[PDB]
Design an enzyme around this catalytic site. Structure first.
Site, PDB file in Angstrom:
ATOM      1  N   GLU A 171       0.825  -1.204   0.000  1.00  0.00           N
ATOM      2  CA  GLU A 171       0.000   0.000   0.000  1.00  0.00           C
ATOM      3  C   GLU A 171       0.861   1.257   0.000  1.00  0.00           C
ATOM      4  O   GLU A 171       0.534   2.243  -0.670  1.00  0.00           O
ATOM      5  CB  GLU A 171      -0.943  -0.011   1.202  1.00  0.00           C
ATOM      6  CG  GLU A 171      -1.961  -1.140   1.172  1.00  0.00           C
ATOM      7  CD  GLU A 171      -2.836  -1.104  -0.067  1.00  0.00           C
ATOM      8  OE1 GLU A 171      -3.235   0.004  -0.483  1.00  0.00           O
ATOM      9  OE2 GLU A 171      -3.120  -2.181  -0.628  1.00  0.00           O
ATOM     10  N   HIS A 174     -14.071  -8.086 -12.093  1.00  0.00           N
ATOM     11  CA  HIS A 174     -13.447  -7.142 -13.016  1.00  0.00           C
ATOM     12  C   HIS A 174     -14.242  -6.990 -14.306  1.00  0.00           C
ATOM     13  O   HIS A 174     -14.330  -5.882 -14.847  1.00  0.00           O
ATOM     14  CB  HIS A 174     -12.016  -7.579 -13.321  1.00  0.00           C
ATOM     15  CG  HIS A 174     -11.106  -7.534 -12.134  1.00  0.00           C
ATOM     16  ND1 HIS A 174     -11.051  -8.544 -11.198  1.00  0.00           N
ATOM     17  CD2 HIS A 174     -10.216  -6.597 -11.726  1.00  0.00           C
ATOM     18  CE1 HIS A 174     -10.167  -8.233 -10.267  1.00  0.00           C
ATOM     19  NE2 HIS A 174      -9.646  -7.056 -10.565  1.00  0.00           N
TER      20      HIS A 174
END
Lengths: 97, 597
Positions: free
Chosen positions: B357, B487
């Site tokens: 992250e 997706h």
């Protein structure tokens, strides 16, 4: 901690576009619309006609590098007029005899 | 007087206006994700529509500046994205119905659920509910009930919505002078304007097909290793030369095989590396997890994090009063505002996730000096790949012994490293054939080579050839497998996962050669080495302002994707899998079916 507030401060603007570069120690407040090309503008926004003044987004949440800094520039010029402003002096003790 | 002066003037003013509205649009989404309120849901839609309609109004003035009179490369790239009208090329009826299908398919995916066949009263949603059960479920029927019944009320229901999704997106590419909608996603890799570095859009089809050929010998040995462990459970349904069932892959769609790492452990008599029990005795909180990861970026020469980054971070979820999404995501607003929304517990995965992250934020700092139009990754695969190479160096035993998580007396040998390389292979190796399969299937359907009736006929036929997976229950053309995928239904790039694996291993091999590390590649650690960080920092600040083929040469010296780093990093595992598969059959056949005997 002062200028930036929640929601943004649009009071502070800047001149993004100008036909040329400013001379040293020159201030131009003209709001006339900048003309990029040969297309006539006549104060009306449109193609190749842009409003030069843009806004500074001010909020406390922005990064440190882009935080607004209040800049005070002192201009030191020595002319042929009599000098007045001088540095601070220092007074010592007085002794007698 | 020249068009270049008029185009640069438009781009100088557009960079300021587009950056102001994009910050408020991303800030409204931040307040909505961190806090669920009636005010934030309206601010996200208001600020989101202002930025969406802003690009539509500026696209009218962008098409009035032809790129034939512009000799500058940086100017044409900034006008390349603004030249596209987006959905404005579609008709008024097809443009309004396009957002309806995207919102309907996204709502059905979120509101979709499968009721328990044994307990009709209890009905569990897919995420988290069904995705959590399918992970640890060892039952044959319990996994089949959730896997088969989902596409019955979802895959069959989204078929008329998927048919309209194909027709609407094809008309957009035809108005944009694209061959098909499958070529639209391939336009992200498009490179033109530089002699010798030009990269055609159709070249990607041959690239992903050629690089996958050298992946086969590595994947066939791993697929036979997983099949050998599950063969004793169901010898009738699982053939030695056959294929593995679809519902036993460890989750719904079989994206990652990590869920099978428990039963596939080669040696269970040796301990495994875990920092979970180590962080408990050290008594670390979410504040010092990001602090120890920030020093990792300093050891390589990269700048540290600003004071506003650590102060505005969201370290936990304050109960149900104020709810935030725990899905780790790195949100980049703008003008130096960097924030990350994640729920941080104490686990071994959260340690590696923190490096991932923070890798996106550290990646955004290099090119932040570029204009708003030039702030982006060079492609869709470089976004996540930069954060992965940061986590790969952290998972090595060398980095764990440096900060004190792992004991310095821990024995490191072949038995310990082979167990570690297998866990990464299930996530890495298992993803490549599945990503090449579904992406190539979308390119064939969007092109028109597969009639509507053969969608499922070619889906499972090409599935046994690529990933070697056969369906327990045969399906007709009514079902649609990709329609249920996250997706595909949300219209996100599915190709970025395949190229990510090749880009991250090239960078892993190049940075370890610059720091003069010796031995196997999985023993490499980039910490404390400032020589590799300088060679990488040059490319990180380029972004998409330069061709990705040119920026890739400045690091690894290669002008395209290469499988050589994929083989060398998995070479210690490939030699061990070959010896254990001698008693079994390497490879699979596509003529075997569980219901056909």
């Amino acid at each position: 901690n002062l200028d930036s507030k929640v929601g943004g401060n649009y009071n502070y603007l800047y001149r993004l576009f100008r036909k040329s570069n400013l001379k040293p120690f020159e201030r131009d407040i003209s709001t006339e619309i900048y003309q990029a090309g040969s297309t006539p503008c006549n104060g009306v926004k449109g193609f190749n006609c842009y409003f030069p003044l843009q806004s500074y987004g001010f909020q406390p949440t922005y990064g440190v590098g882009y935080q607004p800094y209040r800049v005070v520039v002192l201009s030191f010029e020595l002319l042929h007029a009599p000098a007045t402003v001088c540095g601070p002096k220092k007074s010592t003790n007085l002794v007698k005899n | 007087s020249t068009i270049e002066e008029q185009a640069k003037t438009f781009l100088d003013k557009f960079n300021h206006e587009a950056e102001d509205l994009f910050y408020q649009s991303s800030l409204a989404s931040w307040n909505y994700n961190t806090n669920i309120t009636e005010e934030n849901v309206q601010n996200m839609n208001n600020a989101g529509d202002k930025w969406s309609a802003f690009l539509k109004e500026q696209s009218t003035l962008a098409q009035m500046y032809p790129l034939q009179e512009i000799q500058n490369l940086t100017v044409k790239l900034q006008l390349q994205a603004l030249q596209q009208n987006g959905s404005s090329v579609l008709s008024e009826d097809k443009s309004k119905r396009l957002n309806t299908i995207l919102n309907t398919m996204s709502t059905i995916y979120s509101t979709g659920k499968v009721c328990n066949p044994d307990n009709p009263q209890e009905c569990l949603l897919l995420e988290p509910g069904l995705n959590e059960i399918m992970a640890n479920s060892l039952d044959y029927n319990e996994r089949l009930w959730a896997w088969e019944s989902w596409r019955s009320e979802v895959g069959k229901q989204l078929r008329p919505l998927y048919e309209e999704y194909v027709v609407l997106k094809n008309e957009m590419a035809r108005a944009n002078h694209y061959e098909d909608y499958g070529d639209y996603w391939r336009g992200d890799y498009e490179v033109n304007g530089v002699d010798g570095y030009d990269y055609s859009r159709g070249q990607l089809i041959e690239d992903v097909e050629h690089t996958f050929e050298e992946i086969k010998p590595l994947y066939e040995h791993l697929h036979a290793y997983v099949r050998a462990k599950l063969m004793n459970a169901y010898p009738s349904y699982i053939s030695p030369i056959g294929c593995l069932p679809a519902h036993l892959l460890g989750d719904m769609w079989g994206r990652f095989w990590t869920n099978l790492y428990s039963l596939t452990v080669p040696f269970g008599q040796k301990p495994n590396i875990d920092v979970t029990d180590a962080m408990v005795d050290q008594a670390w909180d979410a504040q010092r997890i990001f602090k120890e990861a920030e020093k990792f970026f300093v050891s390589v020469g990269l700048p540290n994090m600003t004071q506003g980054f650590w102060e505005n971070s969201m370290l936990t979820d304050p109960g149900n009063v104020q709810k935030a999404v725990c899905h780790p995501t790195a949100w980049d607003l703008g003008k130096g505002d960097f924030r990350i929304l994640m729920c941080t517990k104490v686990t071994m995965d959260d340690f590696l996730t923190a490096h991932h992250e923070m890798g996106h934020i550290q990646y955004d700092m290099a090119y932040a000096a570029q204009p708003f139009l030039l702030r982006n990754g060079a492609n869709e695969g470089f976004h996540e790949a930069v954060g992965e190479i940061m986590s790969l160096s952290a998972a090595t035993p060398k980095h764990l012994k440096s900060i004190g998580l792992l004991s310095p007396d821990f024995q490191e040998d072949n038995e310990t490293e082979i167990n570690f390389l297998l866990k990464q292979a299930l996530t890495i190796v298992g993803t490549l054939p599945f990503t090449y399969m579904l992406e190539k299937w979308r390119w064939m359907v969007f092109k028109g080579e597969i009639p509507k009736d053969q969608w499922m006929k070619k889906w499972w036929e090409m599935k046994r050839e690529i990933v070697g997976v056969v369906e327990p229950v045969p399906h007709d053309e009514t079902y649609c497998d990709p329609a249920s995928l996250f997706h595909v239904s949300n219209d996100y790039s599915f190709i970025r996962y395949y190229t990510r694996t090749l880009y991250q291993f090239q960078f892993q091999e190049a940075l370890c050669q610059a720091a003069k590390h010796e031995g196997p590649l999985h023993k490499c650690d980039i910490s404390n080495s400032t020589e590799a960080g300088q060679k990488l920092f040059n490319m990180l600040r380029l972004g998409k302002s330069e061709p990705w083929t040119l920026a890739l040469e400045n690091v690894v010296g290669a002008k395209n994707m290469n499988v050589r780093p994929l083989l060398n990093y998995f070479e210690p595992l490939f030699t061990w899998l070959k010896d254990q598969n001698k008693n079994s059959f390497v490879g699979w056949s596509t003529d075997w079916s569980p219901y056909a005997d």
